[PDB]
Design a protein around this ligand. Structure first.
Ligand SMILES: CCCCCCCCCCCCCCCCCCCCCCCC(=O)N[C@@H](CO[C@@H]1O[C@H](CO)[C@@H](O[C@@H]2O[C@H](CO)[C@H](O)[C@H](O)[C@H]2O)[C@H](O)[C@H]1O)[C@H](O)CCCCCCCCCCCCCCC
Ligand SMILES: *[C@@H]1O[C@H](CO)[C@@H](O)[C@H](O)[C@H]1NC(C)=O
Lengths: 105, 270
């Protein structure tokens, strides 16, 4: 009733280019209560050093956080954000969408 | 608009957060161990002398930890049930507009008006009983009033002046195109990414020549840790009609030189 489920948005700071350093972002917002667990995943495995912004809230009192890490993508790697919150039956996973290319030689 | 936010989460596992903001931009944090006010930028001091800053630190100490203790001492009689969260936001703005509002479990609960705390009607008698506690010292309410109508306007004036350079900087966006993940059958989702721009206002549209494509769906504007902004704009199109399409970005920082990217190369693929 008084609980609100998180919106989860995943994006890169720069276009994906294999072998070039970049930043992966996961913006979690519109949730309540503030207790939340957010992991960034590389090939399904949790990335060890991830930072987040100080917890804040919007006009409607719902909370929001930015999680991010520096990373270098290769063409074989898939990245995602995994969020768990009291409003979620099970952890919700949102993938980083990139083109990658080479659809067929 | 400068404001301070207070986040207190009670589990009786706890957590206490105090931070200061120019709208979207964080300028201050409270370090929960040194009891200091950490300034996140050189200009976060505004034109406030080091000793007036130690005065402010004294009052943030005393009121943050008297507020946490008071909330936990009164929680039984106030019928606050664990777990619960208290959120406060207070600051000043039009012309010299000021505010201080408090929420319980994510809903409007009480606010400070002129000289006293008033309950929001829908919040019921619980909020009313809270105001009684909150109103037990008229002097402490007078201090709150002066923090809002005196200290906050002067501070925000000095802060904006001190930060004018940072706050009025222009950072050029970059953009790029990709395929979107969930097109309907027979259709494509064209995605135009715009990243790294500042300040926030931006214009982005899919185009056919000089014709704006009104199907363009702009996402939320999202933050980056370096203080710039991000936006995705998508267009759903039939697979046959994705040729002459381009993405056009307008931003204050470009001085009329729009970014224009063309759906093509391996994106078609040719
Ligand atoms: C990191 C960011 C930094 C950047 C900032 C840069 C510049 C910013 C400057 C301005 C920006 C905007 C400023 C925002 C304004 C701040 C908000 C207001 C702060 C809290 C308000 C009051 C808090 C407080 O003081 N609660 C004290 C009140 O105390 C009581 O009072 C009475 C007298 O004293 C005593 O009663 C006496 O009892 C006896 C026996 O009965 C006799 O009868 C006496 O006759 C009778 O008087 C009581 O004992 C005593 O308990 C209590 O603990 C608690 C109430 C519980 C909640 C408190 C307020 C809710 C939270 C508000 C915000 C908290 C923190 C926000 C930031 C500080
Ligand atoms: C700081 O400078 C601003 C300039 O806009 C001024 O209005 C404000 O009163 C000053 N505050 C001081 C001197 O404390």
């Amino acid at each position: 009733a008084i609980q609100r489920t998180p919106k989860i948005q995943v994006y890169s700071r720069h276009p994906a280019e294999n072998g070039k350093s970049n930043f992966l972002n996961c913006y979690v917002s519109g949730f309540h209560p503030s207790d939340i667990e957010v992991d960034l995943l590389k090939n399904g495995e949790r990335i060890e050093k991830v930072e987040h912004s100080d917890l804040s809230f919007s006009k409607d009192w719902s909370f929001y956080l930015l999680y991010y890490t520096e990373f270098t993508p290769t063409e074989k790697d898939e990245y995602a954000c995994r969020v768990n919150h009291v409003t979620l039956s099970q952890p919700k996973i949102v993938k980083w969408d990139r083109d990658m290319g080479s659809l067929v030689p | 608009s400068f404001h301070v936010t207070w986040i207190a989460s009670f589990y009786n596992w706890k957590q206490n957060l105090v931070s200061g903001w120019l709208s979207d931009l964080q300028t201050h944090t409270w370090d929960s161990n040194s009891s200091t006010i950490v300034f996140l930028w050189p200009w976060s001091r505004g034109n406030f002398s080091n000793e007036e800053w130690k005065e402010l630190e004294t009052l943030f100490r005393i009121r943050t930890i008297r507020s946490f203790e008071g909330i936990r001492r009164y929680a039984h009689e106030l019928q606050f049930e664990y777990p619960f969260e208290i959120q406060v936001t207070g600051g000043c703005e039009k012309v010299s507009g000021s505010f201080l509002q408090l929420a319980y479990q994510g809903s409007d609960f009480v606010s400070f008006q002129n000289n006293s705390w008033l309950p929001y009607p829908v919040a019921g008698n619980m909020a009313k009983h809270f105001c009684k506690v909150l109103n037990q010292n008229q002097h402490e309410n007078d201090i709150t009033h002066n923090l809002l109508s005196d200290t906050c306007p002067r501070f925000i004036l000095g802060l904006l002046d001190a930060g004018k350079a940072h706050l009025q900087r222009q950072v050029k966006p970059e953009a790029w195109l990709s395929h979107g993940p969930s097109p309907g059958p027979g259709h494509l989702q064209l995605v135009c990414h715009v990243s790294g721009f500042y300040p926030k206002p931006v214009w982005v549209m899919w185009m056919r020549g000089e014709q704006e494509q009104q199907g363009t769906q702009r996402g939320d504007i999202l933050p980056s840790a370096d203080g710039t902004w991000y936006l995705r704009a998508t267009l759903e199109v039939a697979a046959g009609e994705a040729a002459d399409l381009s993405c056009r970005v307008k931003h204050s920082s470009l001085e009329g030189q729009d970014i224009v990217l063309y759906w093509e190369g391996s994106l078609v693929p040719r």
